[PDB]
Amino acid sequence: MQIFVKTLTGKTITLEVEPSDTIENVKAKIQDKEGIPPDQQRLIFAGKQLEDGRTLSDYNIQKESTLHLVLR
Amino acid sequence: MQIFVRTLTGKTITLEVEPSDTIENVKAKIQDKEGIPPDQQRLIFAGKQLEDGRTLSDYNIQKESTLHLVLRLRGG
Amino acid sequence: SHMGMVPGLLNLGNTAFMNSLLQGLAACPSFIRWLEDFTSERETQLSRSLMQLLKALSSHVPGEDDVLDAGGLLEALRLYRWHISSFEEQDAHELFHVLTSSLEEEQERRTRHPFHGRLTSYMACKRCEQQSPVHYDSFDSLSLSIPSRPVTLDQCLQHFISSETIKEVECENCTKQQAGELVGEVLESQRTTFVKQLKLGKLPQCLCIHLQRLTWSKEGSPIKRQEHVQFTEYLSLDRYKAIANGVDSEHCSEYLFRLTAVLVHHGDMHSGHFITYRRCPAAPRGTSPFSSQWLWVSDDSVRKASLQEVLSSSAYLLFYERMQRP
Ligand SMILES: [Zn+2]
Numbered sequence: 033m034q035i036f037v038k039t040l041t042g043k044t045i046t047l048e049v050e051p052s053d054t055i056e057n058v059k060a061k062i063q064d065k066e067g068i069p070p071d072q073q074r075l076i077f078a079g080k081q082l083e084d085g086r087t088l089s090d091y092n093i094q095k096e097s098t099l100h101l102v103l104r
Numbered sequence: 105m106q107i108f109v110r111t112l113t114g115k116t117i118t119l120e121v122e123p124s125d126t127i128e129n130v131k132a133k134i135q136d137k138e139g140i141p142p143d144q145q146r147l148i149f150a151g152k153q154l155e156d157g158r159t160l161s162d163y164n165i166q167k168e169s170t171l172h173l174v175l176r177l178r179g180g
Numbered sequence: 181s182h183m184g185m186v187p188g189l190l191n192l193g194n195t196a197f198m199n200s201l202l203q204g205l206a207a208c209p210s211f212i213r214w215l216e217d218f219t220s221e222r223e224t225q226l227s228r229s230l231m232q233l234l235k236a237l238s239s240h241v242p243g244e245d246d247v248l249d250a251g252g253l254l255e256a257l258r259l260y261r262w263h264i265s266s267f268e269e270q271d272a273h274e275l276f277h278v279l280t281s282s283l284e285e286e287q288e289r290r291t292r293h294p295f296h297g298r299l300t301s302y303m304a305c306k307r308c309e310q311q312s313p314v315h316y317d318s319f320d321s322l323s324l325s326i327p328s329r330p331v332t333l334d335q336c337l338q339h340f341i342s343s344e345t346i347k348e349v350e351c352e353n354c355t356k357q358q359a360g361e362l363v364g365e366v367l368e369s370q371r372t373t374f375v376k377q378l379k380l381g382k383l384p385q386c387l388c389i390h391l392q393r394l395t396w397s398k399e400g401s402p403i404k405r406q407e408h409v410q411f412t413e414y415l416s417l418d419r420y421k422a423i424a425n426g427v428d429s430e431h432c433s434e435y436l437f438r439l440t441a442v443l444v445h446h447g448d449m450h451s452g453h454f455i456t457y458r459r460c461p462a463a464p465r466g467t468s469p470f471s472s473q474w475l476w477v478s479d480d481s482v483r484k485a486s487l488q489e490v491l492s493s494s495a496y497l498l499f500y501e502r503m504q505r506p
Contacts, residue, residue: 036446036453036478038180042190042247044453044479078451096446098180098453106350108376112395114325114339116346116376139400146274150425151296151320153277164426167350168312170301170378174323175402177394177496179445179454180194180269 035088036098037062037075045101051089055082062101076100105167107160109147111138112173123161127154134173148172181246184473186237186461188247188480192254196479197272200454201279202230202250203477204441204499206237207458209469210294210385218287226261227286229253230279240461247480272443272454272497273321273390280320294385295320298424303376305351312374314431316381316424321388321497325395326405333411333498336391341420343377380420383435387415387500394449402449411495413439413487437500438470445496453478457490470501 037045047061059070075082077091077099093099105123110116119133131142147154149163149171165171182188186206189199205211212234219231229252236243258264262278280295301315324336354370361368393405415437422431441458455478460471476485 038191038194038196038453038479040193042192042480044191044196044481046478046481096453098447098451108346112325112392116344118346118349138396140396144402146271148277148323149317151277151318152281153274166423166426168303168315169426170315170317172323174273174390174392175394175396176271176274177404177445178197178269178271178450179200179447179452180191180196 033095035093035096037101038098039101040103049088051093052087054084054087056084058082058088058099059084068101068103072103074102074104076102107165108168108170109134110170110172112140112175116170121160123159123165125160126156127158127160128156130154130160130171131156138173140173140175144175146174146176148174182242182482184460185242185475185482185484186239186458186477187243187245188477188482189233190247190249191479192250193267194269195250195254196454197270197275198250198254198257199479200443200456200477201272201275201497202233202237202253203456203458204443204497205279206234206461207440208294208386208499208501209238209462210501212238214291214294215283217291218283222256222260223289224286225252226256226279226282229256230283238461240463269451272445273323276388276497277320293320295388297384297387298381300379300381301376302379303349303374305349305354305372305374306345307370307372308351308353308357310351310353314422316422316429316431318425321390323390323392325392326407326409331407331409333389333391333409333415333495336409337417337420341377341379343375346374346376347371349374380417383417383421383502385502387437387498387502389498389500391496391498393445393494393496404445404447404449406494408492409495411439411442411491411498413491415439415500434506436503438503439490439498440470440501441497441499442490442493442495443497443499444493446494454496457485457493 035047059073107119108116131145215231261282297319299317304311324340327339348371351370351372354372358370397403416433417435418433422429443456446453458475460473474485476483
């Protein structure tokens with residue numbers, strides 16, 4: 033399935049994911065596509081910071097949901 | 105005077121107003137009938153979206169004018 | 181590079197609502213031509229910056245830049261016309277009306293912009309059958325509510341122009357055909373049942389249809405309609421065909437439209453993203469004035485898309501060009 037990751041630095045990324053994918057997996061895919069190290073990535077959905085051990089389905093992240101990526 | 109508002113289901117309701125009424129007032133009357141908070145309402149007359157602080161008289165809104173009510177769907 | 185395609189647009193801080201709209205407007209060559217005529221310094225920054233972006237977004241030959249900076253337009257908006265905050269999400273439809281009205285205001289500071297049409301508004305009292313003066317109201321878009329088996333664009337249009345009855349409407353006529361009552365004497369203002377109906381009057385060269393996906397629940401909360409609304413590449417409006425804009429005035433397939441863009445909202449009632457499906461820019465030697473190729477554009481990211489994908493999408497704003505009369 034497809035989700036969007038808006039960054040604050042002007043790119044909006046598309047990701048191919050499964051609801052079963054963990055946040056760690058998603059950060060891995062963001063690294064693979066953009067070269068941003070997972071340890072620098074903070075993901076936000078509905079004002080909530082996503083945690084590595086959890087999945088997209090855990091946060092009720094749906095097809096074409098939008099995540100915000102903020103860097104530390 | 106009476107004007108019309110086309111609501112979110114396309115049904116058209118009547119509103120009782122004065123030319124001196126502000127758009128905020130009008131939105132309050134719409135809330136009275138439809139339960140929609142004024143800050144969530146967008147009103148359009150003759151393709152122009154009406155703004156708070158203006159009056160119906162400012163827009164040449166006459167008796168039996170039709171306003172269109174739409175909401176604000178945000179995406180970023 | 182973006183060889184067979186168009187530049188993307190930087191997202192300048194939750195500005196997908198602007199980028200999606202720009203990509204859609206860029207697919208309306210009549211609007212571009214109008215703006216070109218129109219644009220030929222702070223007060224005109226909006227139209228100049230919009231013109232520059234649309235031109236760069238409608239070029240058959242790829243330009244020097246893969247991704248464009250819509251900063252002059254955003255600045256003109258935020259500072260001079262629509263005082264929105266820097267990082268707040270907005271409605272592309274609300275931006276659309278800001279642009280058409282701002283451009284018309286630059287104009288009256290001369291043909292109307294090609295999104296401009298007129299509705300006809302007819303109404304009559306059922307008690308005395310007196311017909312009210314006809315209203316001929318401008319529109320820049322058609323905001324269609326979605327009825328409640330799949331829903332079609334045609335059902336939305338049909339619902340839009342269908343007649344309705346409205347109760348407790350003032351009728352001066354029936355008020356004066358009313359006997360007074362000996363109380364002094366009081367004459368009760370007569371409110372009656374009216375039939376009312378909107379019809380399509382003047383049709384624009386560029387058509388913006390707004391599908392109202394955000395509505396109000398019975399429980400008093402906003403809800404987003406997610407369901408598909410079936411629409412077509414070609415739209416005939418022949419079926420759906422004094423006071424003008426409040427001012428007393430004087431009054432004394434033919435309407436075939438071709439889809440050029442579909443702006444889509446992804447998300448819920450409170451927030452999300454906007455993307456645009458759009459035709460490629462017209463080619464000089466095409467066999468049609470329009471390109472048969474489609475693109476999907478999400479801010480900076482541009483890719484080719486199929487018409488199947490376009491038609492299967494969740495349309496929010498639909499953009500059409502009128503095809504030359506028969
Ligand atoms: Zn009557």
